[PDB]
Paper text:
Transient receptor potential (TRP) channel TRPV4 is a polymodal cellular sensor that responds to moderate heat, cell swelling, shear stress, and small-molecule ligands. The cytoskeletal remodeling GTPase RhoA has been shown to suppress TRPV4 activity.
The final high-resolution map of the hTRPV4 subunit with the binding partner allowed us to unambiguously build a model of the small GTPase RhoA, which is known to interact with TRPV4 channels in vivo. Thus, RhoA identified in our structure is an endogenous protein expressed in HEK 293S cells that was carried bound to hTRPV4 throughout purification. The GDP binding pocket is the same as the one identified in GDP-bound crystal structures of RhoA24. The interface between hTRPV4 and RhoA is formed by five loops connecting six ankyrin repeats of TRPV4 and β1, β2, β3 and α2 regions of RhoA. Consistent with our structure, previous studies showed that neuropathy-related mutants R232C, R237L, R269C, and R315W disrupt protein-protein interactions between TRPV4 and RhoA13.
Numbering used by the authors:
A (entry chain E): 2 to 28, 36 to 182
B (entry chain A): 148 to 350
The structure:
């Protein structure tokens, strides 16, 4: 009865791609199609979770996942400052050439690391002064998207809604 | 001791008598049977496929032990599910192999570990004979057992206590199992016998 889509979540390495996928899956580096079941709006849809490598220059295997992808999840990290800006640099032009036109819901997990007094002193020494939502909201406006839910992994309340805005975009045209 | 070639040899050879040492080697070194250094690089072909293509009279005894190591290491829904990642055998799991080899001894065993009864062989090979392909069975395991005259497997995948596939699942093109059978149709009297005998079973 169900329908099923493919999910090829992208990031910049160690942005917390995989630790998210754990939390949605069960409720630790690889995810093949660990077919997860989610009730979006009354359809009881399965969602295939193709976690990808990262920045390990695995372009050997990286492009073998994108064919027939329709729900992309370009990650960044909140404790990652404008290092965040690999999106228009590496990852967006790459999903621009290996999947023609699909949704792009921009993750942004580790939302419970702003107010991190521990890494505040680290990232303060960096001078970099971690990101603003409006900063990546413009990155969202820059790309064209179907959501900018930030996310959170260790602390929950932030994994669930990310797949709502994601799934619903895959159910659209194309 | 265990590189790729030395073991793919073993599993093709059919010997569950000499690889005693996977577990104390593959656990002390902390690796797994699905890592990239233990797969063929082009396809994605892991052991569990290689056993099933290289089958001895309907019986390769090197699926059961392998899965036991994959458990005792810990991966069943990642070792059984590992599909081929090439543009000419895409999707094809162990299950997609265990059905075209007409091997039902192991589909009872795969599905019992929750493999995937709805995977989709999208590859250019598993694509119709008007596109640059050879054989189109739908894309599902159920549709293959149906489009290869196997009433004993169709009657398994839809009545299991483990995993009950459904006839109404929908491939990457829309064509149900029922409109695969009218897409593999060479109008003999052998083709149109089991088609109508199998198209009247599901409906
Ligand atoms: N403190 C904290 N750490 C997180 C959170 N989400 C992920 N991590 C950390 O991210 C690390 C691994 O992330 P991973 O998803 O593997 O990064 P990837 O390389 O992008 O997959 C783990 O050590 C986690 O502690 C979070 O919400 N809070």
């Amino acid at each position: 009865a169900a329908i099923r889509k493919k999910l090829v979540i992208v990031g910049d390495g160690a942005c917390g791609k995989t630790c998210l996928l754990i939390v949605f899956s069960k409720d630790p580096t690889v995810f093949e199609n660990y077919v997860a079941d989610i009730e979006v709006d009354g359809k009881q849809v399965e969602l295939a979770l193709w976690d990808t490598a990262g920045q390990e220059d695995y372009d050997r295997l990286r492009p073998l996942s994108y064919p027939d992808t329709d729900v992309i999840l370009m990650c960044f990290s909140i404790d990652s400052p404008d290092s965040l800006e690999n999106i228009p640099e590496k990852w967006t032009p790459e999903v621009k050439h290996f999947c023609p036109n699909v949704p792009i819901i921009l993750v942004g997990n580790k939302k419970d690391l702003r107010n991190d007094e521990h890494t505040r002193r680290e990232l303060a020494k960096m001078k970099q002064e971690p990101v603003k939502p409006e900063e990546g909201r413009d990155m969202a406006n820059r790309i064209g998207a179907f959501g900018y839910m930030e996310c959170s992994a260790k602390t929950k309340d932030g994994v669930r809604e990310v797949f709502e805005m994601a799934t619903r975009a895959a159910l659209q045209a194309r | 001791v265990f590189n790729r070639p030395i073991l793919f040899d073993i599993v093709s050879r059919g010997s569950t008598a000499d690889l005693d040492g996977l577990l104390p080697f593959l656990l002390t070194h902390k690796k797994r049977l699905t890592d990239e250094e233990f797969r063929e690089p082009s396809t994605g072909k892991t052991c569990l496929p290689k056993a099933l293509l290289n089958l001895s009279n309907g019986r390769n005894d090197t699926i059961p032990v392998l899965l036991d190591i994959a458990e005792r290491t810990g991966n069943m829904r990642e070792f059984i599910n590992s599909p081929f990642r090439d543009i000419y055998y895409r999707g094809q799991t162990a299950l997609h192999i265990a059905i075209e080899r007409r091997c039902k001894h192991y589909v009872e065993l795969l599905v019992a570990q929750g493999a995937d009864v709805h995977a989709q062989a999208r590859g250019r090979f598993f694509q119709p004979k008007d596109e640059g392909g050879y054989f189109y069975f739908g894309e599902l395991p159920l549709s293959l057992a149906a489009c290869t005259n196997q009433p004993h497997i169709v009657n398994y995948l839809t009545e299991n206590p483990h995993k009950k596939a459904d006839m109404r699942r929908q491939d990457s093109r829309g064509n149900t199992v029922l409109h695969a059978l009218v897409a593999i149709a060479d109008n003999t009297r052998e083709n149109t016998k089991f088609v109508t005998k199998m198209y009247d079973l599901l409906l």
